[PDB]
């Protein structure tokens, strides 16, 4: 029996985790087992207790990708030496060069472009955090120091909740997974936790056994349905109709929480029947334009709705049509938003809503009634943001939550998007360490914004002061809406101005709306970068893979962008499909091979330590060090070339020779370990870690619950404090404290009375079918994040690829396939008016008829390297160019039109 006992041996064990952005980030603590100087295997530590005795713990955490990551570290997907292109881009001809040569070529290309046209020539395109918080910090810090252009990561990927943004004025709200244990009714929608949250899926099945009713709203009977009591089989993109049907039920049957609606929302605010706009004090007595009104039926009069608190001292009217005399002496009819909604929901009776979304009447009525009487928590996943009209779908869900009083309470919530990213953003901008006063300027600037805000409006909240700050700082550091440069520089105007692929309720194209928006000053030159008359010349790939990530990027990048680019360089651990087109690939240290910390959110609300268990192989470098070296070389090469200064985008001069000293804080930050210690200090300084929770304690324990959302948007958006003894849930301040919302109406706002919305037919939540993006083809293609990989991190891993068919697959309904003469395992062409791809077919009864599904794959896993994404176009929702309204705005990760609307794109399928 000693031959198996032989295997159960090792030399040492360290803490590890994975920096790939699973979401909610699992932040799973592993034992990393090293032997013979190599990572042999890993296993979950399972040391994450419950919040208290009544709740389920988080143990063991983990997933199959994490639990087999040792295979990544020794896999043939790794790049271990700097490579320089030998053939054409993408030809697969490489030679090894030194870091010196590779960093030198990169630096020269940076210099060349800065000399030719200033800093607009450099693009760090939407890096994600997969390489690590410190790598993200490095890339951002670099771009900021150089005043380069960094398209917004979140808008670029399509992880946003614009309907939340537009209803509540914020989206950075979340709950922790154990919050489901306090819900009586749980809706998993536009999401697939079986695939996408395996570390905490258990809270869903365990809530079920505790008595929670679990509902999966999905077009397909999706992989999460084994935990579900009910599948709500929506037609792709039709969720609004479902949720409006539910709202109609609660209103018609008088099941709604009248008090909550009257307090929390715009439903009782009065709207003018002549203009369609909220009745304002300006209209009535020449007061404030944003002072709005309730009707007091007892008093027989319009009464000002407070801008400063949601607390009510009487019950506003909901039902009715009334009159108001304006300052003109003219009398008009006014009615509450609610009264308009009652009319509007006549088109969403269960019978009618059922016709629109394909959900049976019985289920619409059952769930209408249940939502009104049950503490209800949802998880809206990021397929919502990837739907053209996800905002409408989300607004409609929030209307049902409003009507049922389902927010601001234990066991409520909609997603997990509250998090502290202080460790990354302070690392990214500070000129000196935290312990040396590095946060002082930022912290005094933050106060400035608060003072200015209160001055503008003394009813303003901290949350509002923080948003104004965010709007400014985002543009000061070169973070820009990604639609702009894609439109102006990557030829996407030719796709996005196609009226055939636009919502037909819109009166004009995306670009026409853009022109109107810039004419009105809603987008400035600090948003539209690189400027249209600049040419992108240097393009940095870091935790980003545009060949699959950009919708239609597989065509638009090679055909339009790459030809303009003098240098494409990648900081990679792995030979991604996009790295195959690079001029220079720089090898990086991977998980367990560099000190790091995970980047958790509310869902799994603990930071986890990642040790350097083993040295990186070959000439793999930490990304901070790699970037530091590039910047030193920029300085050195500039000096050798007799150059001193370059112009930033505002035409101010910056010295090449100070880039490296600034980046490293004059030698203080050279390694991940250096940066980790600084991130720990940052977390201590902002309350995310206890003040006495040092790096020494962190290294020893391996993980710790965070104690706050830090100092960024989440701290205010989340609108609750973190109490580690109970599940995290948002919006408590709004409900308990009657705190106003940062919106036009100061309330959770279902009526958007902005001209564009009024004209588009979207002033109220409403159902619009997905635009016919791709042309008139009969399937609606949907996707999802892969079960089998965290993004592409494991898509080129032999070991993990043996858990599946090892290649791209399209899931089709069995009968649909049969009707096209296609069998399981056949190849098929997917195509539309724009492009095509070939993919292996999986047939399943669980796919909705005329739906097909591709969970994403890396582009070089496909024939001709044409991924399904090639046909996805990414039509941005033009209404998201809107400004001139409080909650219509852009700051980092929030707002602007996301080019991400791939869910429901039209494709045809034929056998190949």
């Amino acid at each position: 029996e000693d031959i198996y006992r032989k295997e159960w041996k090792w030399d040492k064990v360290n803490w590890g985790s994975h920096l790939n952005i699973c979401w909610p980030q699992g932040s799973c603590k592993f034992y990393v087992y090293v032997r013979n100087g190599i990572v042999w295997r890993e296993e979950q530590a399972a040391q994450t207790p419950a919040c208290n005795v009544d709740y389920v713990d988080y143990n063991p955490l983990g997933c199959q990708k994490g639990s087999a990551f040792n295979n990544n570290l020794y896999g043939d997907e790794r790049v271990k030496y700097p490579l320089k292109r030998v053939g054409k881009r993408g030809e697969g001809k490489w030679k090894r060069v030194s870091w010196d040569e590779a960093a030198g070529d990169i630096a020269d290309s940076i210099i060349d472009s800065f000399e030719a046209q200033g800093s607009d020539g450099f693009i760090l395109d939407a890096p994600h955090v997969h390489a690590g918080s410190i790598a993200w910090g490095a890339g951002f810090r670099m771009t900021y120091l150089m005043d380069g252009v960094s398209p917004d990561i979140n808008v670029d990927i399509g992880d946003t909740y614009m309907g939340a943004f537009h209803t509540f004025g914020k989206m950075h709200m979340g709950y922790s997974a154990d919050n489901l244990l306090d819900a009586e009714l749980i809706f998993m929608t536009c999401s697939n936790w079986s695939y996408t949250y395996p570390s905490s899926y258990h809270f869903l099945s365990e809530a079920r056994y505790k008595g929670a009713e679990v509902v999966v709203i999905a077009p397909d009977f999706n992989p999460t349905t084994p935990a579900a009591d009910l599948h709500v089989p929506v037609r792709v993109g039709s969720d609004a109709a479902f949720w409006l049907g539910l709202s109609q039920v609660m209103i018609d049957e008088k099941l709604f929480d009248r008090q909550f609606v009257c307090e929390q929302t715009d439903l009782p605010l009065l709207v003018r029947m002549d203009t369609g706009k909220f009745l304002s004090a300006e209209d009535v007595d020449g007061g404030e334009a944003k002072q709005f009104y309730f009707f007091d039926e007892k008093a027989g009069s319009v009464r000002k709705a407070s801008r400063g608190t949601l607390k009510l001292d009487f019950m506003p009217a909901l039902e009715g049509t009334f009159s108001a005399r304006l300052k003109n002496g003219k009398t008009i009819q006014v009615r509450t938003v609610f009264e308009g909604l009652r009319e509007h929901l006549k088109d969403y009776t269960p019978e009618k809503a059922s016709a629109k979304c394909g959900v049976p009447v019985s289920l619409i009525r059952e769930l209408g009634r249940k939502v009104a009487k049950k503490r209800t928590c949802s998880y809206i996943g990021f397929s919502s943001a990837k739907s053209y009209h996800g905002d409408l779908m989300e607004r409609s869900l929030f209307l049902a939550m409003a009507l049922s009083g389902n927010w601001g309470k234990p066991g409520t919530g909609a997603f997990a998007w509250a998090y502290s990213d202080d460790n990354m953003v302070y690392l990214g901008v500070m000129s000196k360490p935290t312990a040396q006063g590095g946060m002082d300027e930022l912290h005094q600037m933050a106060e400035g914004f608060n003072k200015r805000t209160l001055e503008a409006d003394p009813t303003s909240t901290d949350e509002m002061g923080n948003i104004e700050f965010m709007k400014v700082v985002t543009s000061a550091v070169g973070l820009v809406p990604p639609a702009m440069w894609l439109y102006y520089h990557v030829g996407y105007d030719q796709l996005w101005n196609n009226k055939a692929w636009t919502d037909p309720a819109l009166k004009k194209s995306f670009g026409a709306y853009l022109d109107e928006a810039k004419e009105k000053g809603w987008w400035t030159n600090d948003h539209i970068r690189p400027a249209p008359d600049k040419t992108p010349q240097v393009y940095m790939l870091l935790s980003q893979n545009p060949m699959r990530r950009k919708r239609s990027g597989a065509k638009m990048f090679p055909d339009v962008l790459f030809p303009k680019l003098k240098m494409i360089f990648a900081l990679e651990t792995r030979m991604s499909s996009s790295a195959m087109y690079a001029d220079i690939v720089l090898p990086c240290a991977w998980y367990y091979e560099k000190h790091e910390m995970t980047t958790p959110c509310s869902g799994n609300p603990f930071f986890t330590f990642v040790d350097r268990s083993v040295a990186p192989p070959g000439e793999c470098r930490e990304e901070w060090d790699a970037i530091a070296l590039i910047l030193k070389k920029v300085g050195e090469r500039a000096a050798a070339r007799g150059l001193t200064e370059f112009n930033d985008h505002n035409g101010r001069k910056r010295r090449y020779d100070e880039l490296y000293k600034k980046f490293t804080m004059d030698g203080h930050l050279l390694t991940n370990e250096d940066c980790l210690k600084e991130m720990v200090d940052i977390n201590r300084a902002v309350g995310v870690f206890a003040k006495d929770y040092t790096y020494e304690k962190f290294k020893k324990e391996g993980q710790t619950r965070f104690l706050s959302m830090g100092t960024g948007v989440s701290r205010y958006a989340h609108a609750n404090e973190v109490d580690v003894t109970k599940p995290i849930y948002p919006m408590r301040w709004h409900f308990d404290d009657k705190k106003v919302f940062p919106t036009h109406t100061r309330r959770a706002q279902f009526y958007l009375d902005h001209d564009w919305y009024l004209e588009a037919g979207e002033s109220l939540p409403t159902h619009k079918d997905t635009p016919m993006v791709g042309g008139d083809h009969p399937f609606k293609i949907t996707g999802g994040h892969p079960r089998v990989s965290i993004h592409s991190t494991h898509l080129t891993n032999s070991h993990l690829s043996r858990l599946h068919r090892g290649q791209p697959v399209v899931h089709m309904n069995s009968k649909d396939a049969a009707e096209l003469g296609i069998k399981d395992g056949d190849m098929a062409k997917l195509f539309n008016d724009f492009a095509d791809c070939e993919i292996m077919v999986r047939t399943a009864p669980n796919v909705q008829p005329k739906q097909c599904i591709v969970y994403f794959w890396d582009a070089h896993q496909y024939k001709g390297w044409k991924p399904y994404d090639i046909l996805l176009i990414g039509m941005p929702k033009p209404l998201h160019l809107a400004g001139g309204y409080e909650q219509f705005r852009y700051y980092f990760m929030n707002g602007s039109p996301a080019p991400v609307t791939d869910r429901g794109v039209r494709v045809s399928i034929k056998k190949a």
Binding site: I3, E206, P223, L803
Partner: protein
């Protein structure tokens, strides 16, 4: 004499394959074991693992031994080879792509481990499927043991673990044909057969077996069937909600499954019903005639919870403290052999 048992709660299983990799990354990365998924997880309805194992005979009928047939490498999930060098470095551009090649045929695979993932059964709008984790059952009446003419297979009297003595094994593979679960696997390098060892190197140090311990879905319980304080005893023997897989194969298997409740289906009228869509006879095919009772108990107990009455059963199946699932096998996985 005692018997180690595992309970697997199919309601909780999310098909993540962590258990698959947990096993593989200790035991089955050695030459000749790469195809072996001693812990395997596939979608049900499906062909299972190995492919069509339910058609391959073995076991006992009326206590009569049944002939069986040997799985192939492909049946056993293959060991896909990939072409990294070809795609990245060979100057072939987009004329080649990253893809698997069968280790058996040297060509593109038309099957492999978990090939029928997420497919399942039923008919729209009532499709159904769940995930089915399996390992060696460490049977009370093991057919594998009975089959080996060299007597290389034995069942530990202390804990009921069934093992193939790797020194005496000659690779005759009668055991493979005889095991109606096809839970013994030929190693063509050693030319012996191998199988789940119930992680005995770990369990003899009080460390839970890896496929149980590493399951993020908290699906798995483990322990001695006679230990009246254990989850496994309470679910198999007391509540009797954890049922054997294919007990009609005559081997007395010692893994037990909590059958899936499943999602409510739609009726012929297209309206929502109050009944699961999973056909009872399908679940009965796998877990026997007690399925109906079990589903009824699960629903009743779940209602007891919901109503504020409490339920030991729901407490057990939820297990708010994870380590309580493991029957006293609670040592951290930090003691070596």
């Amino acid at each position: 004499k005692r018997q180690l048992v595992t309970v697997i709660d199919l309601n909780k299983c999310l098909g993540c394959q962590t258990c698959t990799v947990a096993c593989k990354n200790i035991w089955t990365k050695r030459p000749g074991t790469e195809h072996m998924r001693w812990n395997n997880v596939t979608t049900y309805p499906g062909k299972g693992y190995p492919r069509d194992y339910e058609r391959k005979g073995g076991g006992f009928l009326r206590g009569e031994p049944q002939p069986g047939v040997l799985p192939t490498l492909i049946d056993s999930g293959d060991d896909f080879q990939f072409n990294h060098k070809e795609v990245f470095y060979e100057g072939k551009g987009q004329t080649v792509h990253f893809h698997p090649t069968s280790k058996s045929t040297g060509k593109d695979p038309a099957w492999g481990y978990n090939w029928d993932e997420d497919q399942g059964g039923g008919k729209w709008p009532n499709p159904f499927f769940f995930y089915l984790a399996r390992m060696c059952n460490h049977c009370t009446n093991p057919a594998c043991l009975a089959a080996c003419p060299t007597g290389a297979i034995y069942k530990r009297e202390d804990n009921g673990i069934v093992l193939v003595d790797q020194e005496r094994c000659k690779g005759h593979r009668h055991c493979v044909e005889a095991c109606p679960y096809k839970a013994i696997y030929f190693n063509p390098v050693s030319q012996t057969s191998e199988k789940c060892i119930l992680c005995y190197p770990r369990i003899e140090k009080g460390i839970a077996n890896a496929c149980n311990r590493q399951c993020p879905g908290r699906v798995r319980a483990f322990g001695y069937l006679d230990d009246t304080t254990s989850h496994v005893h309470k679910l198999v023997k007391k509540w009797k909600v954890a049922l054997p897989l294919h007990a009609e194969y005559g081997t007395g298997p010692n893994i037990y499954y909590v059958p899936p409740m499943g999602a409510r289906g739609f009726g012929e009228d297209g309206e929502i019903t109050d009944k699961t869509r999973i056909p009872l006879d399908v679940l009965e095919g796998l877990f026997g005639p007690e399925v109906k009772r079990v589903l009824a108990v699960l629903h009743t107990e779940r209602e007891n919870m919901r109503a504020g009455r409490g339920s030991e059963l729901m407490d057990l199946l939820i297990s708010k403290k994870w380590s309580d699932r493991f029957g006293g096998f609670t040592n951290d996985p930090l003691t070596q052999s």
